[PDB]
Design a protein around this ligand. Structure first.
Ligand code: WY5
Lengths: 200, 195, 193, 203
């Protein structure tokens, strides 16, 4: 189904942990509204969210950032701020490889939902009790996305593959965001500097 | 053994360039861009090749020299994790769906034609050639495996795995730790016992 | 469990600022430079503290929560943990590194003139010279029988640097304590309405 | 004395050619190590471990020091300007070599005896994994840095802090060390254009 994925998509310094907690929770609420996700073992649900949270978050804010130049919306962080916090390279990749590609092809929210659902339903995730079941749910999602794309954009016969071929970029940007601690430098950066200037 | 590795590398790079030149329209790109695509691509292209070659082998990979490497050796050289990912995420997935050599070729051609490669003079042209390749692959899949309507997507969805395994092979120096470990010890000793 | 870690971090950062301000001449640096030194230094400063605390423990580190190397190897960070033990904790034990000597090393680490963005690196270098001049005085007087003790102290800093970067790169702290707390978090979220 | 350390210090197919350059460089490094007192008296297993543990920092220390006689470049005989380094995608690491090592060595006029002794300290690293007798390596490192302090106190008595200043370049050497591994710094520098030149065998 493609209607419940779009429906899902539409619906003290270190205590940066609170902001993180709230962000992760938004992500869990979304996952629970993806058909069949909540019918997986609880251990498997946790593994998929642990495996997925980084790429899922980047996909969200990348897409939000379509409405913005040389920035991402969380609110608004300009690329000059990102370069200043020593994560310029990774930020520019988000812009060129994700945000602009999403803009150029006017990726809609149903299509974002389905990609995120493919990422979430990752049968490669380590420790999954039944990877075959996860694979099966991902097949349902991308079968459903192809149906949606063929109907809404029949003039764009390549559109389905183009969507799927943004996932490799998402994966590498994924790993670079972990490795550079991208999320926690973005929200945590100045709050820390501001805290520390309690040496005044 | 060290001289073998360096020759094998040279031969592999050469094989890789000859292959790329025989991909339609590749040689019609700017020369700067051809170099960028091969330099951006050689890691994933090589892993795709040997992963697929390794379909015909249990708990191992075959390298295009002939050199079979079992996972026992890989875990012994302290790259067990990365080796197991190659096996589970690539080799077995390729086996399970019986990925044929046409389908490997088209994926390698998609990887080669990477319009995200840094410094490309005309990314739009590279993107255009990748569209031709994956349009051609979908045609092939729909006709040879009409019973498997999801086969095209399944092929494309091995590329993220290839990307991460790609970066992990760089980051761990996967190739050099596999074959190069004791050859280096042997090298250094030869140098140490020389005058 | 997660809430506790985040509080402990906040408390650690605070302890760290109070400490730095009580280092002579630190507070006489530009505010921009003070922030840079603490941001550049917090990782090595913390590892130096808990490494030294862990002298009183076998095959473990003390952070109140004792962490045994069996748990560390089980959480896939055995390599980094063993480096902390062999290169820092045991070396500190073997030479009976005292708390004055730890303080001076931490002060040398803090006064890092290599820190990027420093307005006046020459001033930071000058304060580090004062610190390590002071440490040599201390070493030569308390351990005159150990004429190489000063150099030995300074030659633990490279280890501190590499273990520093390896702890960042592996997310050493988060994988140690944060593993199951995260699983527990996500379940809390999953069984919420 | 520390004369033997200074004496030590004052001595188509694109991948194959990089490998030859590497081979030659590593060999110069072994010849140097053999002329360090007591090194050749270690077990052969231990000698191999120290060179395996050490080669990256030892090489960087050499070329950093050689590069004192050069602006916004490093000397390997092939001078490499920072423009080329930034072009080969290793600009960050190159700038660190310049700021943290080359300029610091220039500013304090580090001489070749002092470089030798630091390299000898790096070589005699008792933290190296698998050493048969790390106590012996530690003992040789103590001899080296005891000898360096003697040299510094005599040649630069006006600079009482010069010994510590020398030793406190080693952390920088370590981090630049790990960054050079992680980026494959050496092989991108020497291997860079040879590859580009090879590949431009498209016609
Ligand atoms: C020991 C060692 C050193 C290095 C490297 C790797 C190792 C290295 C050596 C062994 C030997 C081994 C052996 O003695 O059989 C082993 O099992 O695992 C190793 C793992 C390693 O990472 C790389 C490839 C990262 C290049 C940089 C240097 C420092 C030369």
């Amino acid at each position: 189904p493609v209607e419940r994925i779009l429906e899902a998509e539409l619906a003290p310094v270190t205590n940066i942990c609170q902001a993180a907690d709230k962000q992760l929770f938004t992500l869990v609420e979304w996952a629970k509204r993806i058909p069949h996700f909540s019918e997986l073992p609880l251990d498997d649900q946790v593994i998929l969210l642990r495996a997925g949270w980084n790429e899922l978050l980047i996909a969200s804010f990348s897409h939000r950032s379509i409405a913005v130049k040389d920035g991402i919306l969380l609110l608004h962080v300009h690329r000059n701020s990102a370069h200043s916090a020593g994560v310029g390279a990774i930020f520019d990749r988000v812009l060129t490889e994700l945000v602009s590609k999403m803009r150029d092809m006017q990726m809609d929210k149903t299509e974002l939902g389905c990609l995120r659902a493919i990422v979430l339903f990752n049968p490669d995730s380590k420790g999954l009790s039944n990877p075959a079941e996860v694979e099966a749910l991902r097949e349902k999602v991308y079968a459903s996305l192809e149906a949606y794309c063929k109907h809404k954009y029949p003039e764009q016969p390549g559109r389905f593959a183009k969507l799927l071929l943004r996932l490799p970029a998402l994966r590498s940007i994924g790993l670079k965001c972990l490795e550079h601690l991208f999320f926690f430098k973005l929200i945590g950066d100045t709050p820390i500097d501001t805290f520390l200037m309690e040496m005044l």
